[PDB]
Amino acid sequence: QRNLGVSGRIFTIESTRVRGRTGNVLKLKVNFLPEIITLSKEVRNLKWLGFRVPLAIVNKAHQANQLYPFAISLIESVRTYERTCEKVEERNTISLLVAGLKKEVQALIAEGIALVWESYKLDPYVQRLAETVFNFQEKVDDLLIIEEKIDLEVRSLETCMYDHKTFSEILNRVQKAVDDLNLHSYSNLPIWVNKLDMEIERILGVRLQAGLRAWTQVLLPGGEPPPIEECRYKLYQEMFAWKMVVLSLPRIQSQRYQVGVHYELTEEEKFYRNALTRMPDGPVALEESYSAVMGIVSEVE
């Protein structure tokens, strides 16, 4: 009554309801029902038991078993696509980087919807879809580990000792992670790093505010900081030593490898000189630093 058999299109985009979503969620399955897979084991097992299986069912079961090796490759290949895409949806941050790889898999799956089980192209196609989806899964798994490292480091900038070498060490580790992303060729890397640069700039701007106020307090989070005109020069020279702790740090670059491709980088692009403008409390903290230098010089004069 079931009329078990395999033929026609290899995929079947079925409609399934997901709780909490009014729209019916479409899911992709290989057009090779589990009942067929159960049928191959059924016929084989009943024969040794001594039951004379009808020859019609042996023909149906035997026909699909010839297509079983391709079916199991697609079922796990398709299932791997679903779970890898599920991992991407969990973390919206890494969505841009896997844009290039997700494009190819949607192209290969787009190719497979046109095929039928009898196509001679099903041999090279199963290996291609199986291989590419494995590449998609491996790169996404690496990205979840690579970005966790970048996320742990950028949060480390908030709560590290206000010394230049410690700040450089954190950005050095963040830079190496970006360089490995550049090698893998995850797409949209320049767009993503720029978002990472602004969040690093914000954190360094906040830390620079604590640096100036802590420097201001010692003069009268923030670390442990001749004629009359020389005293003013010495105080500002000391402040520039404190200000350059953060503003002299290297700027995270997204295309460190594209070398020989000549685009000149200005001083602003090389370092976080603009981080002074990203203080949370506006330029108020910078004024207090300059004012305190004016106050001491006023008293000495």
Partner: peptide, 21 residues
């Protein structure tokens, strides 16, 4: 910014391609 299509819209498009064939 090259952006991958969402799974739902992509599968709707593929359904439209498949049914009309």
């Amino acid at each position: 910014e090259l952006a991958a299509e969402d799974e739902q819209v992509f599968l709707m498009k593929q359904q439209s391609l498949l049914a009309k064939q």
